[PDB]
Design an enzyme around this catalytic site. Structure first.
Site, mmCIF file in Angstrom:
data_model
loop_
_atom_site.group_PDB
_atom_site.id
_atom_site.type_symbol
_atom_site.label_atom_id
_atom_site.label_comp_id
_atom_site.label_asym_id
_atom_site.label_seq_id
_atom_site.Cartn_x
_atom_site.Cartn_y
_atom_site.Cartn_z
ATOM 1 N N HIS A 21 0.298 94.483 -9.166
ATOM 2 C CA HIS A 21 -0.976 94.026 -10.262
ATOM 3 C C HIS A 21 -2.154 93.834 -10.777
ATOM 4 O O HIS A 21 -2.271 92.939 -11.541
ATOM 5 C CB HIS A 21 -1.461 92.781 -9.147
ATOM 6 C CG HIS A 21 -2.562 92.999 -7.949
ATOM 7 N ND1 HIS A 21 -2.379 93.554 -6.778
ATOM 8 C CD2 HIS A 21 -3.362 93.255 -8.007
ATOM 9 C CE1 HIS A 21 -3.540 93.729 -5.827
ATOM 10 N NE2 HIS A 21 -4.061 94.293 -6.925
ATOM 11 N N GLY A 59 -11.476 95.206 -6.991
ATOM 12 C CA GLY A 59 -11.920 96.487 -7.249
ATOM 13 C C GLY A 59 -11.564 97.379 -5.862
ATOM 14 O O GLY A 59 -10.831 98.764 -6.627
ATOM 15 N N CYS A 81 -8.836 97.157 -4.285
ATOM 16 C CA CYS A 81 -6.945 97.043 -4.482
ATOM 17 C C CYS A 81 -6.840 98.554 -5.093
ATOM 18 O O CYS A 81 -7.433 99.307 -5.153
ATOM 19 C CB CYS A 81 -6.343 96.227 -5.398
ATOM 20 S SG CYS A 81 -7.218 94.321 -5.174
HETATM 21 C C1 LIG Z 1 -6.916 94.336 -7.285
HETATM 22 C C2 LIG Z 1 -8.378 93.682 -7.544
HETATM 23 C C3 LIG Z 1 -9.058 91.953 -6.723
HETATM 24 O O1 LIG Z 1 -9.735 92.503 -6.020
HETATM 25 N N1 LIG Z 1 -8.325 91.266 -5.878
HETATM 26 C C4 LIG Z 1 -7.097 90.606 -6.623
HETATM 27 C C5 LIG Z 1 -5.854 91.026 -5.504
HETATM 28 C C6 LIG Z 1 -4.553 89.927 -5.901
HETATM 29 C C7 LIG Z 1 -4.812 89.756 -7.196
HETATM 30 C C8 LIG Z 1 -3.207 88.532 -7.736
HETATM 31 C C9 LIG Z 1 -3.182 87.102 -7.246
HETATM 32 C C10 LIG Z 1 -2.163 89.602 -7.343
HETATM 33 C C11 LIG Z 1 -2.849 89.270 -9.758
HETATM 34 C C12 LIG Z 1 -5.808 89.600 -8.333
HETATM 35 C C13 LIG Z 1 -6.654 90.212 -8.122
HETATM 36 C C14 LIG Z 1 -8.873 90.363 -5.291
HETATM 37 C C15 LIG Z 1 -7.549 89.144 -4.087
HETATM 38 O O2 LIG Z 1 -7.287 89.212 -3.696
HETATM 39 N N2 LIG Z 1 -8.112 88.230 -4.858
HETATM 40 C C16 LIG Z 1 -7.192 86.275 -4.091
HETATM 41 C C17 LIG Z 1 -5.492 86.979 -4.682
HETATM 42 C C18 LIG Z 1 -4.747 85.758 -4.233
HETATM 43 O O3 LIG Z 1 -4.966 85.757 -2.336
HETATM 44 C C19 LIG Z 1 -3.933 85.009 -2.387
HETATM 45 C C20 LIG Z 1 -9.792 90.904 -3.919
HETATM 46 C C21 LIG Z 1 -10.560 91.338 -3.050
HETATM 47 C C22 LIG Z 1 -11.582 91.177 -2.389
HETATM 48 C C23 LIG Z 1 -10.623 92.313 -1.695
HETATM 49 N N3 LIG Z 1 -9.577 92.517 -1.994
HETATM 50 C C24 LIG Z 1 -8.920 92.172 -3.226
#
Ligand SMILES: *CCC(=O)N(c1ccc(C(C)(C)C)cc1)[C@@H](C(=O)NCCCOC)c1cccnc1
Ligand SMILES: *CCC(=O)N(c1ccc(C(C)(C)C)cc1)[C@@H](C(=O)NCCCOC)c1cccnc1
Lengths: 304, 304
Positions: free
Chosen positions: B41, B143, B145
């Site tokens: 991602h 950030g 990830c």
């Molecule tokens: C890796 C960036 C990030 O912080 N983050 C995230 C992860 C994945 C995605 C995709 C939807 C796969 C493009 C975007 C952003 C978030 C996160 O998971 N946000 C929600 C995504 C959708 O949930 C179903 C993140 C925040 C805090 C901790 N880990 C990840």
């Protein structure tokens, strides 16, 4: 999101750990520049432990009696001196992995990470707090002496603790890196009982703020209190008195969440008086006190 | 003595962390040999997150669109491929700090350490468990990830997790190092609800053994039970069923303490039915389940 008991990355300290042997006693040493720091009780034999006269015991020891091993290679000892309860072994080689470092003496309530070692090799890393009775509740077995406690500010490792002993009650005692014990403890196998292990109130409040930031808000009440009213309840529950310095320190957490420090004190007061009622806060059934307000800010902001 | 939630020393993994940027998205990467592993991602833009077609999005990306930085120095990307939900970026330089390593896929209940990173830099290390619903309760901000989970056997780092996302409920989801998610989760910003977070029964039993070894014995009862009777109570309390494999795994702990596994099951059954009554076990007011029987043996024996 999520809030964990988190230790600092341990790599910078891992590169400093050495094995120190004197006679038949082996413990850990910290190698910074061309000096290896270790507990002076490395010179004690089976029974010396009861009433050691370290100056006298040290007279029978020369540089060649201290065996320092870094990895599987031996370091040459060219000098040795006792500073309080630590031995400083001057070696002929500066540690190539010496990070930027400071020796700091922390106050009770302050947290730090411990890299538990055996035979100069790290086994694990965990987060601790210097208790208000100057003990630490670590996880240390025989041979763990010389393992250190530290904090990291970007690239500077501040060493604050060196493990020396376990009291008869299973709690731990040690020194700062100048060899001065935290608390009234002595490196002698004698009856040394710790004082009241009170709860670090400012740390509990910081952790309640962390819980609010992370969505755990059930405990937030409709009340407020004063420092004097709160402290009357705190004393009753064996909590440390809260000062205006502590209120000031919690200011950024109060600002971020919009919950005034005295309002959080009132919520804590109700938790003390009513209990948790089988509920949990950040996956814990008791009030956590080993996160400082700085640790809450660091973890909640992602400081590297 | 003392029992702590302890993570593995993180140095070997710290030397593998890099920053990966694609477009305006920056996350962490794991640099092993001449390959950098990161969540796929990283190629998603602000909104792609809702319904990404990774194969399609990857067509618009060349080697030069992936910016890999190790420390403050840039690595040259000479190849890139997608394996499941991870991107493998072939670089022209083998990581000089590559430790001995394995990629393992763990089962629920298994614990591991996480080195939480931001912008390729480590911020902290904590101990986790793969929950029975294939989530982890970590501490990860935007950030984080690409931060990894791992176990260490002497000098071999077994990487088992790579962080990818946070579910709407604040729990975490990720993959093994082959890019296969643990559980049914997908790298897409959609409604993904986790299943029942049951308690890891074998882990609670291992931790009760650790408590006995450490002097906390108040909960030891005069009763015994059977696997079938115990499991009826376990199901009622949302505990994982205990199998004969789990009883076998706890054998060394049973031998060391002289407390038969089924006797410890009966003690656990009484704790579930009666509660803790305001008491604590190893400084905890709830039954801890993020220590495996192997972790208890390791910590209680001092494995380095
Ligand atoms: C890796 C960036 C990030 O912080 N983050 C995230 C992860 C994945 C995605 C995709 C939807 C796969 C493009 C975007 C952003 C978030 C996160 O998971 N946000 C929600 C995504 C959708 O949930 C179903 C993140 C925040 C805090 C901790 N880990 C990840
Ligand atoms: C450093 C060796 C060790 O494991 N250890 C210890 C510490 C100090 C001493 C002296 C008495 C100062 C010579 C001997 C041995 C023990 C320990 O503290 N044992 C009890 C000493 C007297 O208590 C008042 C140790 C075991 C577990 C954890 N940390 C240290």
């Amino acid at each position: 999101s999520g809030f964990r008991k988190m230790a600092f990355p341990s790599g910078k300290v891992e590169g400093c750990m050495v094995q120190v042997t004197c006679g038949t006693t082996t413990l850990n040493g910290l190698w910074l520049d061309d000096v290896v720091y270790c507990p002076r009780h490395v010179i004690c034999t089976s029974e010396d432990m009861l009433n050691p006269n370290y100056e006298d015991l040290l007279i029978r020891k020369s540089n060649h009696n201290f065996l320092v091993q870094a990895g599987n290679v031996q370091l040459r000892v060219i000098g040795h001196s006792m500073q309080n309860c630590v031995l400083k072994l001057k070696v002929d080689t500066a540690n190539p992995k010496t990070p930027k470092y400071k020796f700091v003496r922390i106050q009770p309530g302050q947290t730090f990470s411990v890299l538990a070692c055996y035979n100069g090799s790290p086994s694990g890393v965990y987060q601790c707090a210097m208790r208000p009775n100057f003990t630490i509740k670590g996880s240390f077995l025989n041979g763990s002496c010389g393992s250190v406690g530290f904090n990291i500010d970007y690239d500077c490792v501040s060493f604050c603790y060196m493990h020396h002993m376990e009291l008869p009650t299973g709690v731990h005692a040690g020194t700062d890196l100048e060899g001065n014990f935290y608390g009234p403890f002595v490196d002698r196998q004698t009856a040394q009982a710790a004082g009241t292990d009170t709860t670090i109130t400012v740390n509990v409040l910081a952790w309640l703020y962390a819980a609010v930031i992370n969505g755990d808000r059930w405990f937030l009440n409709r009340f407020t209190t004063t420092l004097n009213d709160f402290n009357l309840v705190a004393m009753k529950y064996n909590y440390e008195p809260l000062t205006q310095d502590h209120v000031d320190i919690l200011g950024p957490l109060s600002a971020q969440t919009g919950i005034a420090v005295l309002d959080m004190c009132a919520s804590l007061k109700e938790l003390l008086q009513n209990g948790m009622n089988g509920r949990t806060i950040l996956g814990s059934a008791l009030l956590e006190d080993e996160f400082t307000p700085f640790d809450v800010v660091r973890q909640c902001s992602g400081v590297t």
